[PDB]
Amino acid sequence: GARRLELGEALALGSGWRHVCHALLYAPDPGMLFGRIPLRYAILMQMRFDGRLGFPGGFVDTQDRSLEDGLNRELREELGEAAAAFRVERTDYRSSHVGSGPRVVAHFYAKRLTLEELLAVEAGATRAKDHGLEVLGLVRVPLYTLRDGVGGLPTFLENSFIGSAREQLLEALQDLGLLQ
Numbered sequence: 295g296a297r298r299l300e301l302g303e304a305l306a307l308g309s310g311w312r313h314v315c316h317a318l319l320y321a322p323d324p325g326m327l328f329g330r331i332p333l334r335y336a337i338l339m340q341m342r343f344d345g346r347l348g349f350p351g352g353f354v355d356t357q358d359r360s361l362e363d364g365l366n367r368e369l370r371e372e373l374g375e376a377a378a379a380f381r382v383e384r385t386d387y388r389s390s391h392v393g394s395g396p397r398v399v400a401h402f403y404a405k406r407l408t409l410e411e412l413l414a415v416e417a418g419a420t421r422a423k424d425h426g427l428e429v430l431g432l433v434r435v436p437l438y439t440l441r442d443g444v445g446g447l448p449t450f451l452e453n454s455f456i457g458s459a460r461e462q463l464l465e466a467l468q469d470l471g472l473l474q
Contacts, residue, residue: 295394296393297393312353313399314398314400315353316348316459319405321336321406321411323335334472335472336413336434337434338416339433340372340430342428343433346454348455350373350429353368359360370423370454376419388413402458404469414416
């Protein structure tokens, strides 16, 4: 799997279906590694309790009035109060997928931050409710490939990922024009 669904199709699914929402948070970063390698963007992922990298978010509950209300609620639980500086909205929606097995549809969003907003999220995240329990720590995604042709992004992508997070990441990187 997973199979890609249109949003209308995902929203038509029955009451037995749970909806999970995750967000790629990113900010333009003018920085240069070793003074010569463009960073391009700061992009956040999270190491989860099961030893896999993914994106912040979680499950929509029965009192969320919208997918975006659920997403923002979960992001704030996971990342803490700096996440309350912004709202991921329907304009940030990118995709929906259903895998085999449990009745879960996974919705994916990407939200542009300022670098100051992103740094605030990283700075506060260790005091979030989920820190050291369900989540183990944020990492930035290295967007460059080092001289040896392996270090940086290719190596990063050899890490362990949750569900469709690797696919979701690569699609977002494509959309940002980082994959040529």
